[PDB]
RNA sequence: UGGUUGGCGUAGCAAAGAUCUAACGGAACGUUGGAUACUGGAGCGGGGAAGGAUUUCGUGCCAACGGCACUCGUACACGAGUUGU
RNA sequence: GUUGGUUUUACCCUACUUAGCUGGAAAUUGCGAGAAAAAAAAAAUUUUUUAAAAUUUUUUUUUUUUUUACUUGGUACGAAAAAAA
RNA sequence: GGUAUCGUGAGGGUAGUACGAGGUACUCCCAUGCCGUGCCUCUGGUUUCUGGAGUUUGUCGAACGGCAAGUGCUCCGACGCUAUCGCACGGUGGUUAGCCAGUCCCAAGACCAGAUGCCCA
RNA sequence: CACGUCCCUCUCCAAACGAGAGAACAUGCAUGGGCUGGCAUGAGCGCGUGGGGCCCCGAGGCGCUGAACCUUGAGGCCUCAUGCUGGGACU
């Protein structure tokens, strides 16, 4: 006898019914806090590693640089476009209603369509003309009265700005809409944060901050109808085995006289929703145009960019704000991953640690990439024939 | 003859192909799609299904037939693209627009009103199975018959 | 023709917002501007039919991307199916024709030895009503070549 | 820290040690909590029950202890520096961990030398 | 940035793997290699001098 | 004993590497050219015994048969054909 | 005691494992009517404000088009004019 | 009534575990093992990018370029996949370790008079 | 018939097939370039075992030459540059 192969609380292992990785539960509201947003949609870019000086009493690495992998997650600001209130009921939370923003970016209204550009594009057209009228202004006014009254939960309906993402590979132009809960103070305080913020952008740096952790939720990378050996980790059978090796030899017994829900079976692996915890935020990163010397740490002064030399493979440059957080993040490159405020206690000696990066890595992913910089590669090879066949042309002109 | 007499002999064209040597089950599927359709949209469905642009919704004679996305049109997941059966159907619909034309009727107002692929007497052939056995192979040719009134 | 007229209003949908935005950007270091680098406001396809239904395009077909990890002894036959699929997109023809010049080239290194690229000399012809004849365009090097419709 | 397991039971690592043992045959790894089919596996710094398979007969047929001081199976430092050896040899040692040799042959690993205060001293080098 | 034992490529903190030969140099017990190509090229005991992409090659030329 | 059935348009038709092209044909696979491979002389070569006995050949045909298809066939029909001191 | 000694079939049903589709609240019907809804409206239970004057006309407000603050191409408020309530 | 979007969450699943060292004999630390959930920056493995090179016999009259050897063979080899062979992570509350709730996973045949967008010939 | 959905078509974070995600004139696709990598110095002409009668034959070597080629394709990057640009079903 050995332990069971696989966690039964991650089950059924079925395809997620979404891809945007929506938060399942927001961290519990704390009135003592000032109001804030609790999550932020971001696009996985790729990974690198960083050097860091761990300064953790105990261990053999205190005061010693350690190479942590990091995931880079491009994070163009989300736009709030509507508030949502929930009222508690004996049967469970009910939306009171939502107040949509007076205006909606097309990328958002793209979301209500399968073919926006061959549509009449009438989405939020009556709201636009009605929220304008005093009749619809008083109606919007009444919804907020209902929030301030009957609500227990205020939530912004934010979305991603894919227009601003300018990624060439994330093909979506429908915005990634999602309610983002406002934990904070009294419901009027949450309404007020909610409505002042009701058509504004929301950068991650406001929601998060460095060294703080974030729970991540994104659908994990899809593997199709995976077999039982890859899906559950069961031992494959000895070579001599007949019908085939890669099987659970015994999927049941005489009784109960049927396969139980607990025996492992071939089927969908990957592309499951996951909430992974306590991912330290090694740096929030401002957009490359605004703060070009990303990845230029105090100890590595060369002006530099968070994106590797070949760009991120399959993704390309991170043109925007980026969250850089320790370790792996579930989901393939360029998937949209919601990442919430931590729901764990976060009073751990580790979790509270400030993270001063000593060296973001920027070598090519693609090959081994022994250069941190496109300038430095040229500084190795120096001029070569592509230039001499270039330099000569310039002289002739 | 025809299972159902046309409502108005002068206004309808009949067509038929006995002992059609296409599978009954595929032709059963292929002709039933057409049963209410206007002849031009039925000429069309076949020209399109002959291009793998649309599918014939297999319905009764599904079996462990494969899922397609072109079957959404028909309300179900299974669908299929007979070619031998789609061509015989066009070739029987040519037969009726010809029959419809001679009656002075206009083929492009004409509507399919009755399609009925009966299964025909079957042709024997032989397997040669494992340990010295000889099980049957049998084609299942269909009798397809139809008529198409034009509205008055 | 309401859609053609409606599409012209749809072109104005951008030109209305686009015209207003250009003036504001002119009023206000590597930041994107209308004159910075191409035109920021216009869509990618704003730059652009019934071309004479009789032309002779000449374009490189990068086969190797189109045959990567294909079964080796199926490479040539599908190099040829793909050169037709490649060219059917341009000529919009259901009736492409691969002349001996191009069949031999796809094949001259045998089934699996299919050349990395090919400079086809496709030509639509009037008369399967429109048909294309896909010739080879032998060349010492594919570098710096580009599709040249004529 | 973590050192990717290198020398499963049944392995014959060399004796780097001064002693007349020529090579060790790992028998089991001390501190090995076992999963079912998994073979116990010594890695760098690990104490190991080992019988000398070749060398002075006096050592030859009893189970002995031996820490692993180098390892062909490469491992990753927390420093992010994956590293490995030409060979993977251990040294004979007491259950206490005092080494019975008088001087180790080749280089000793950094995390051999840090777990074993005596091994570190006799080590010609640390790596 | 240690530089490779063979090609003398710059080898940054996350990259390459070290290798400790039994026949250590004392001075250089651990021999960094940027790449498997550099290590195999060393197991052949090729001198870096004749392999053109290495720096020791380019330096003499 | 005959017929019919569900399973089921399913299980399969996955051994021996392979076809591609144009032109023509045709109501729509063959034919030719080219290309490409294969057999690889203990051959998918050229002749014989046994055995088969018209399968030969031409024209036509393709209803049935050639487990897909055939415009083609060892199939079908018709006409031919085997020469000795 | 010794030695040598064919391990066949799921393509059915259910279980299960993933994967889809579609109905359905008199669980497909009845029209057989039950809401964890509210019981002139909104803002600070009561008070004040929101078309008017003789169906049409006039006035006011809001939105769209043209000529600073937001991540920085594209949307907001600026203005002015037109349309709708 | 369509279509679409955001959610609700009854119900069901459910997981973390162990060892050691430190520190002072609880707290508090710090590593590891196992388990589990991922991920692929690095490192290893994997090559049908038959990528690039080398190379053997046959072959293309030869060089070049190939080609055949069912991927000829050897070297290096990106993408990708993957390894406790790399790496990240594994949270609470309430009741009597259990147990229940939560977090976590599926979640309206739990038919959600929840919200919402659009059109309602 | 509206809104719209779907198919066909294109893309892939999806994928046995359905489903999914997206696109829907869009740097969308296509080539090309630049880059990031890979390999490792192409073709071609211009020191050397000896050999043949100052040249010729000569493996190898040198020089141009980190060259040549390959680099997104089951789907690296860059807008950098040019090229090419709806029908059907349903209610
Ligand atoms: Mg067996
Ligand atoms: Mg990489
Ligand atoms: Mg099947
Ligand atoms: Mg099927
Ligand atoms: Mg027999
Ligand atoms: Mg089958
Ligand atoms: Mg041969
Ligand atoms: Mg004959
Ligand atoms: Mg006969
Ligand atoms: Mg009803
Ligand atoms: Mg592409």
Closest CA to A329 of A215, A185, A245: A215
Q: Do A49 and D79 touch (CB under 8 A)?
A: no
Question: Binding site for Mg(2+): what residues of B are annotated?
Answer: 64
Chain A CB contacts of D79 under 8 Å are 61, 64-67
Closest CA to B14 of B24, B27, B4: B4
**DSSP 8-state assignment for residue D36:** S
A146: tokens are 């209902």
CA B132 to centroid of ligand 5, rounded, Å:
5
| Positions in chain F where some atom is under 7 Å from a protein CB | 4-5, 7-11, 17-23, 33-37, 64-68
The C-alpha of E15 sits at a distance from chain A's nearest C-alpha, in angstroms, of: 8
Half-sphere exposure of C88 (CA within 13 A, CB side): 12
Q: Residue A286's beta-bridge partner residues?
A: none
D72: tokens are 């062909």
Scanning residues 279 through 308 of protein chain A, those with a beta carbon under 7 Å from any atom of strand G turn out to be 286-287, 289-290
Give strand ranges (E) for chain D: 7-8, 14-15, 21-29, 41-42, 47-55, 63-68, 75-76, 82-83, 89-93
Question: Nearest nucleotide, C1' to the C-alpha of A272?
Answer: H105
Task: List the determination method.
Answer: cryo-EM
Scanning residues 23 through 62 of protein chain C, those with a beta carbon under 7 Å from any atom of strand G turn out to be 23-26, 31-34, 40-41
Closest CA to A324 of A22, A36, A42, A30: A42
Whose tokens are 């950068």? That residue is: A203
Distance CA E6, CA E53 (A): 10
Q: Do E13 and D80 touch (CB under 8 A)?
A: yes
Provide, in whole angstroms, the distance separating residue A102's CA from nucleotide H56's C1'.
Answer: 77
What percent of chain A is helix, strand and coil (3-state, nearest 5)? 20, 25, 55
What percent of chain B is helix, strand and coil (3-state, nearest 5)? 30, 25, 45
Among D68, D81, D90, D124, the residue to mutate for chain E (most E Cβ within 10 A): D81
Closest CA to A309 of A323, A325, A295: A295
Half-sphere exposure of C48 (CA within 13 A, CB side): 7
* Ligand number with the minimum distance to the CA of A368: 2
Question: Nearest nucleotide, C1' to the C-alpha of A224?
Answer: I15
Question: Nearest nucleotide, C1' to the C-alpha of A200?
Answer: G70
Scanning residues 2 through 61 of protein chain E, those with a beta carbon under 7 Å from any atom of strand I turn out to be 35, 37, 52-53, 55, 58, 61
b/e map of B45-58 (b: 16 or more CB within 10 Å)? bbebbbeeebbbbb
For residue D73, the chain E residue with the least C-alpha distance is E19
Q: Do D84 and E19 touch (CB under 8 A)?
A: yes
**DSSP 8-state assignment for residue A7:** -
| Cβ neighbourhood burial of D108 (10 Å; 0-12, 13-18, 19+) | buried
Distances in whole angstroms, Cα of residue D19 to Cα of each of A200, A331, D54, D79, D90: 76, 54, 12, 34, 11
Scanning residues 6 through 25 of protein chain C, those with a beta carbon under 7 Å from any atom of strand G turn out to be 16-25
Asked if the Cβ of residue C8 lies within 7 A of any atom of strand I, the reply is no
b/e map of A323-336 (b: 16 or more CB within 10 Å)? bbbbeebbbebbbb
Q: Which residue of D80, D87, D125 is in closest CB contact with E29?
A: D125
Question: Peptide bond preceding A256: is omega within 30 degrees of 0, i.e. cis?
Answer: yes
Distance CA D77, CA D1 (A): 8
**DSSP 8-state assignment for residue A299:** T
Distance CA C107, CA C119 (A): 14
Among A60, A69, A70, A238, the residue to mutate for chain D (most D Cβ within 10 A): A60
Distance CA D16, CA D88 (A): 9
Question: Binding site: what residues of B are annotated?
Answer: 64
Q: Do A67 and D79 touch (CB under 8 A)?
A: yes
Phi, psi of B73 (to 5 degrees): -60, -30
DSSP output for A166-235 = --SS----S--EEEEEEESS-HHHHHHHHHHTSSSEE-HHHH--TT-EEEEEEEPPP--EE-HHHHT-PP
Chain A CB contacts of E12 under 8 Å are 359, 361, 363, 370, 372
H or E element in which residue A385 lies: helix A385-396
Q: Widest CA span of chain B, in angstroms?
A: 64
| Dihedral angle, C-alpha D43, D45, D51, D56, nearest 10 ° | 130
Q: Kindly report the number of other CB atoms within 10 A of residue D114's CB atom.
A: 14
Distance CA E52, CA E61 (A): 9
H or E element in which residue A154 lies: strand A153-159
Closest CA to B59 of B74, B70, B73: B74
Q: Are A214 and A208 a contacting pair, CB within 8 Å?
A: yes
Half-sphere exposure of D102 (CA within 13 A, CB side): 2
Closest residue to H106 by CA to C1' distance?
Answer: A12
Q: For chain E, list residues whose CB is within 8 angstroms of any CB belonging to chain A.
A: 9-16, 34-35
Distance CA A323, CA A210 (A): 9
Provide, in whole angstroms, the distance separating residue B141's CA from nucleotide F28's C1'.
Answer: 21
Distance CA B80, CA B55 (A): 5
* Ligand number with the minimum distance to the CA of B64: 4
Size of interface D-E (CB pairs under 8 A): 45
Q: Under 8 Å CB-to-CB from B9, ≥6 apart: which residues?
A: none
């Amino acid at each position: 006898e050995h332990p069971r192969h696989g966690h039964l609380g991650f089950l059924p292992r079925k395809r997620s019914r979404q891809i945007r990785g929506r938060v399942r539960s927001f961290p519990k509201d704390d009135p003592s806090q000032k109001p804030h947003l609790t999550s932020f949609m971001v696009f996985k870019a790729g990974m690198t590693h960083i050097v860091r000086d761990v300064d953790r009493p105990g261990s053999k690495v205190n005061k010693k640089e350690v190479v942590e992998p990091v995931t880079i997650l491009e994070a163009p600001p989300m736009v709030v476009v509507g508030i949502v209130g929930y009222r508690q009921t004996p049967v469970g939370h009910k939306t009171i209603g939502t107040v949509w923003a007076h205006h909606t970016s097309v990328e958002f209204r793209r979301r209500f369509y399968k073919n926006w550009k061959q549509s009449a594009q009438l989405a939020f057209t009556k709201r636009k003309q009605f929220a304008r009228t005093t009749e619809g202004r008083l109606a919007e006014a009444r919804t907020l009265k209902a929030f301030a009254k009957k609500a227990d939960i205020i939530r912004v309906v934010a979305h991603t700005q894919l227009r601003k993402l300018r990624n060439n590979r994330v093909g979506v132009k429908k915005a990634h809409v999602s309610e983002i809960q406002i934990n904070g103070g009294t419901i009027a305080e949450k309404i007020e944060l909610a409505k002042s913020l009701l058509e504004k952008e929301v950068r991650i740096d406001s929601i998060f901050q460095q060294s703080e952790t974030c729970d991540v939720c994104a659908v994990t990378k899809g593997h199709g109808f995976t077999g039982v050996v890859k899906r559950w980790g069961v031992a494959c059978l000895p070579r001599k085995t007949h019908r085939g090796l890669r099987k659970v030899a015994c999927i049941g017994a005489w009784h109960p006289a049927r396969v139980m829900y607990t025996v492992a079976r071939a089927g969908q692996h990957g592309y499951h929703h996951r909430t992974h915890l306590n991912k330290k935020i090694y740096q929030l990163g401002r957009a490359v145009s605004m703060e070009p010397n990303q990845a230029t740490t105090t100890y590595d002064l060369t002006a530099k960019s968070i994106t590797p030399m070949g760009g991120f493979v399959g993704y390309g440059t991170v043109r925007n704000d980026y969250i850089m957080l320790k370790g792996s993040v579930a989901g393939p490159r360029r998937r949209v991953i919601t990442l919430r405020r931590p729901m764990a206690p976060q009073t751990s000696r580790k979790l509270t640690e400030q993270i001063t990066l000593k060296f973001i890595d920027t070598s090519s992913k693609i090959g081994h990439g022994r250069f941190q910089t496109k300038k430095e590669k040229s500084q190795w090879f120096g001029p070569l024939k592509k230039d001499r066949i270039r330099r000569e042309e310039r002289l002739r002109k | 003859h025809y299972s159902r007499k046309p409502q108005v002999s002068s206004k309808s064209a009949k067509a038929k192909v006995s002992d059609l040597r296409c599978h009954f089950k595929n032709t059963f599927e292929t002709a039933n799609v057409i049963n209410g359709m206007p002849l031009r949209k039925a000429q069309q469905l076949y020209r399109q299904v002959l291009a793998k642009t649309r599918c014939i919704p297999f319905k009764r004679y599904n079996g462990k037939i494969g899922r397609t996305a072109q079957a959404k049109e028909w309300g179900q997941t299974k669908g299929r693209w007979p070619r031998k059966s789609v061509v015989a159907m066009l070739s029987l619909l040519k037969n009726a627009e010809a029959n419809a034309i001679e009656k002075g009727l206009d083929p492009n107002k004409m509507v399919i009103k009755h399609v009925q692929v009966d299964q025909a007497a079957r042709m024997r052939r032989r397997t040669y199975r494992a340990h010295g056995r000889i099980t049957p192979y049998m084609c299942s040719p269909c009798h397809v018959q139809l008529f198409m009134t034009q509205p008055q | 023709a309401l859609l053609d007229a409606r599409k012209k209003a749809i072109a104005s949908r951008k030109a209305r917002d686009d015209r207003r935005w250009k003036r504001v950007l002119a009023k206000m270091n590597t930041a994107e501007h209308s004159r910075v680098r191409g035109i920021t406001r216009a869509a990618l396809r704003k730059r652009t039919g019934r071309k004479p239904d009789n032309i002779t395009m000449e374009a490189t077909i990068h086969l190797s991307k189109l045959l990567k990890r294909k079964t080796f002894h199926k490479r040539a036959p599908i190099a040829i199916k793909r050169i037709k699929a490649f060219v059917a997109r341009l000529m919009k023809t259901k009736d492409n024709r691969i002349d001996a010049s191009l069949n031999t080239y796809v094949w001259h290194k045998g089934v699996k030895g299919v050349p990395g690229r090919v400079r086809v000399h496709v030509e639509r012809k009037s008369e399967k009503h429109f048909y294309t004849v896909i010739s080879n365009v032998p060349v010492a090097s594919f570098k710096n070549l580009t599709t040249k419709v004529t | 820290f973590r050192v990717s397991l290198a020398l499963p039971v049944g392995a014959v690592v060399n004796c780097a040690d001064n002693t007349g043992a020529k090579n060790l045959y790992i028998i089991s790894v001390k501190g090995y909590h076992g999963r079912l089919n998994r073979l116990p596996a010594a890695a760098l710094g690990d104490i190991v029950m080992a019988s000398v398979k070749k060398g002075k007969p006096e050592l030859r047929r009893k189970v002995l202890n031996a820490v692993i001081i180098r390892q062909r199976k490469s491992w990753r430092r927390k420093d992010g520096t994956v590293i490995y050896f030409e060979d993977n040899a251990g040294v004979i040692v007491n259950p206490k961990g005092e080494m019975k040799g008088s001087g180790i042959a080749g280089p000793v690993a950094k995390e051999a030398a840090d777990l074993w205060p005596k091994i570190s001293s006799h080590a010609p080098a640390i790596v | 940035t240690i530089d490779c034992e063979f090609s003398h490529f710059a080898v940054h903190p996350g990259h390459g793997r070290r290798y400790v030969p039994f026949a250590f140099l004392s001075t250089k017990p651990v021999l960094t290699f940027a790449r498997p190509k550099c290590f195999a090229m060393y197991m052949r005991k090729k001198n870096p001098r004749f392999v053109p992409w290495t720096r020791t090659y380019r330096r003499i030329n």
